Symmetry: D2
Subunit: 336 residues, 4 copies
């Protein structure tokens, strides 16, 4: 089996031959057709997060492929299905959060391409109970971002409380933000999209945004206040200190700021104003299995189309180099 | 009419005589039996808050008195009723937040003892539509802190989402905390009380706390996780950097931290861990008129008893710098 | 002033000159341009409801016009605005439901066209605090049904708990249903529209329905179950016993049936299945002033277009027996 | 193994020796210490429900006992634990409802003592994933009714939306009602208890009820409206036509009526008034595994104590005929 392997942190990945996974009870083997790439894989490759991955590691948490083998007793998933192996690789099923449909918080969870070998290979293994069933409408390459950017942003907009007709602000129309934009519109929301580029403001407007702001030409918060009077919710994707503060202060009283990005250090919040304005700051990333089904259904109905460009497994270090220089407009999917 | 007046910021209040208020339509004149004092009155006297009160100012937002005069058209309040003038002196009645029962967020709101003359006098004026109706069961000295600490902490626990049988952490057993703890117990909650003193821990235990922690002898986040497994909600009264730090870390995954104190500068939060653990940070101060009714009823049912000491209007500057040195165990109420 | 008056029940309305309304404080006089007609006006003319209107009565609760005169101290509405005088003519502003933004449930409420003279006239009076401000985009004759059918069905879909992406069933594509359709579509919902005619099936599919069913040709409950597996929510507009039964049994487990129609008598429900399936049966009619602004905004943005026929005020009784035999495809509005 | 077996519906149960259960993977063998009895067992023995149990059947869904054998791969349940085998014997774990923590609605669920042999025996089998963990504080006999009556009524009060300080009404203080009012009091609610006996009125008053009503001496609807102005929520345990209407009309506008009883036929509801008052009728029985843990914790803390009388397995037909005559004051638990 060919696989791109992280041998040790910061040092380039080695495309090399390794054994195929063998199944234990409840697992299926997936012949990978595609696997999306995002910044989580980078942080997995660099090991710069608080809890580090197990080396050597096959990254990838957006693998889409065909089930070619099922272990004894797997009935729900059948050989031939097209499934996804997401970030939420497995959960305990018995804890506080598993019992209440909050599988994303399970303290015993395994994470695909981080705590366990992911889809940067020709075959990947996963538990039948946690794979995502890909709808028949969708190509594996175009769907792979939904397993990550899709479910994360869709769940964040549910968490935000924004109801149809209300205004939402999305700070950062990058990898996730350009996908967060289409979910918001499909959820009956009016969107103000905020970025730092005339190109992305054009991108956002073409993807459906009602208002696009080049944040380096207009102060976005007083433009949001002057035009729509503040937003009921704001999705903070860009988590640099300025965009986070700007996303916060765009939220009117009694509104919610949902943060979906993972910043490098702590972030300051004017708690003083937070108390007198009844504002909430909620954290949210990825989603529950039920969240996954709904996120994928929006794509199956055509309401959310990721901007994708394919790359070969061998180019994985060049995609990473390309990702650190910020020249990825959208997301890049590995093809197999 | 005798009144304690702020003529200039940070200089001592002058007890002196001044005009009785005369009513325009919709307002009532109450002769004040008692008026509580909290730190908000001092921040009005020092004017160290972003938006300052215009001088001269009669402070006091916890005034309880007897209606002795009603303007023309006052259908509700009658002469002889015992009413309270709270922090939410008035609201527009037609904005976004007034139509949805969120009067605390009205951008045109006037605040008792800050933007309008309050209860540091023998007579105060207030609109009939926004005065609190004090229940017949209670003594004006006993119920004045409910108008502030009572409704604030009760509404905070409501928005905390903590349900009967769940565990709540209250950081700061001070003016608000000792009242917050009684409300939590009355809502079926198990309480962990956290403070900086063996005496305050022995105060919270007496008031009903299931667990009381001296924060300078045990690591409180160590004890809460070891004994309870993290709390579902935490009320942050003490908003110093380390207490805010500990209160946050005591909330388990998916839980909410409600902040009720007003800090002097921004506060840092590990937004990284906030995202991965689905944690919410909500701000909450004071409560709506409906909130005020429900808070007063708990006190009318004997479930909340504020620890109160009396003082008279002339020693108002002595209670202020007694408050700044921090040995007011509970709250003080002005006697008239 | 010309007005269509109900002198007594079940006999024809008389067009007749009457006195122009006198404005007391807080009220406003409106020169009516158009006033909608629905079945509530008929029940008001026939007096066949539990609590009857006191006679003589000028019906009409969907009146749209120009304010020509404001009383003393009218704070918000200035002469020249276009407003609407809905079914909730006024509320006390003090009770349990007024304080929490549930003004529709105020036990002291007055109802336009029923408890007070409505818009079946050239001029109508209404309190400034409770008239709907029509947006500038909309012409008075097409927006009149939003005051009734628009705010009712929109609030009903909010009460239903149906979230974007989910399926809803709308039983009855009549007056309220054809408007319910568009609101649901604008809220991200997929819609199954059920009625008794091939003509209304195309009517629903014409305005956005994903599925239309002629209830007299297919079993709609088996159709809904075979095609979408039951609906999270169902809106019951047709409250004849067979449509109510079908609407209920189209709701899946854990779902909600919102009823907006007003039936003649009690209706039977399989509470046995309600208990074991976790189903809710909620009632909802009209909407609060906030609900009215939101429902009006959807029409302002062209997302809800009522199907409308004009008639002169003198044809009112022709419109009524027209209505009693089901000739009306949509709604009819009086023109002035 | 000794067991009470239903060989044929309506004909007495036979206490007879049968084969003890054999373990397949994931299951545990429990030696029953106690097993409560309720009317669900009666309807299982009479086979008078829509979907009947297949015979022969060992009833019992409140069996408490000690685990004496676990199949291989069972690691969470350990030999020696005291577990419960509730009505929710097993769920599929993948459907719409199992994914969202609503496993009570799983269409593939198996029911203890109905779809599979239950606790009317010395040994009963159950899946480890779905047994209830009995707290160490409590004796198997007094904890058995928590498995049924306890979790049902606790969930129904959670579904009722009733919040601390608000008033609840419990109609029928029999088997479920006398556990319901304890839960309500433990959740900070004020309880009006309604029955048809002065002996049960006093029983409720002894168990914590704030007001007890004998419905056959006072009109309970006028008593509730005149003493408290209607209740925000009402639990309907007695589902006879008269008490169902009384429970409904006890609910004030915007309130919720939760029904936990299983009536024999459809019940009429004045849908006309349901719409105009915005009242909800919700159905709720048994609870989720998480609900079971919270229900059991209230008993562990001593806030819910069922009224229990012991009988022996051989007297199973004599408690049944005791049950049909209505001589059961509370609940009766079989002892082994
Ligand atoms: Zn990703
Ligand atoms: Zn878990
Ligand atoms: Zn306002
Ligand atoms: Zn205060
Ligand atoms: Zn109408
Ligand atoms: Zn009212
Ligand atoms: Zn039972
Ligand atoms: Zn299931």
């Amino acid at each position: 089996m060919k696989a791109a392997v992280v041998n040790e942190f910061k040092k380039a990945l080695e495309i090399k031959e390794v054994e195929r996974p063998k199944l234990e009870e409840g697992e299926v083997l997936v012949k990978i057709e595609a696997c999306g790439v995002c910044h989580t894989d980078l942080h997995a490759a660099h090991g710069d997060w608080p809890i580090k991955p197990k080396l050597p590691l096959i990254p990838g948490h957006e693998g889409v492929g065909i089930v070619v083998e099922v272990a004894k007793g797997v009935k729900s998933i059948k050989v031939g299905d097209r499934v996804g192996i997401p970030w939420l690789y497995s959960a305990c099923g018995e804890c506080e959060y598993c019992l209440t449909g909050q599988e994303t918080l399970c303290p015993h969870q395994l994470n695909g391409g981080y705590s366990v070998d992911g889809g940067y290979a020709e075959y990947c293994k996963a538990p039948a109970d946690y794979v995502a069933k890909i709808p028949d409408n969708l190509d594996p390459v175009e769907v792979a971002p939904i397993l990550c950017a899709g479910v994360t942003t869709y769940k964040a907009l549910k968490v935000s409380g924004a109801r149809p007709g209300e205004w939402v602000a999305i700070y950062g129309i990058g990898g996730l933000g350009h996908i967060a934009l289409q979910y918001a519109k499909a959820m009956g929301l009016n969107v103000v999209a905020v970025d730092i580029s005339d190109e992305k403001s054009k991108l956002a407007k073409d993807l459906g945004a009602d208002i696009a702001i080049n944040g380096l030409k207009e102060d976005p918060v007083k433009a949001i206040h002057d035009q729509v009077g503040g937003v009921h919710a704001a999705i903070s994707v860009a988590v640099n200190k300025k965009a986070f503060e700007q996303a916060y202060q765009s939220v009117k009283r009694g509104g919610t700021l949902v943060v979906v990005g993972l910043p490098n250090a702590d972030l300051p919040i004017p708690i003083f104003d937070t108390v007198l304005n009844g504002v909430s700051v909620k954290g949210s990333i990825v989603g529950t299995r039920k969240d996954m089904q709904e996120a994928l259904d929006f794509a199956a109905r055509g309401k959310v189309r990721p901007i994708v460009e394919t790359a070969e497994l061998e180019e994985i270090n060049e995609v990473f180099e390309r990702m650190e220089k910020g020249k990825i407009n959208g997301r890049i999917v590995l093809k197999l």
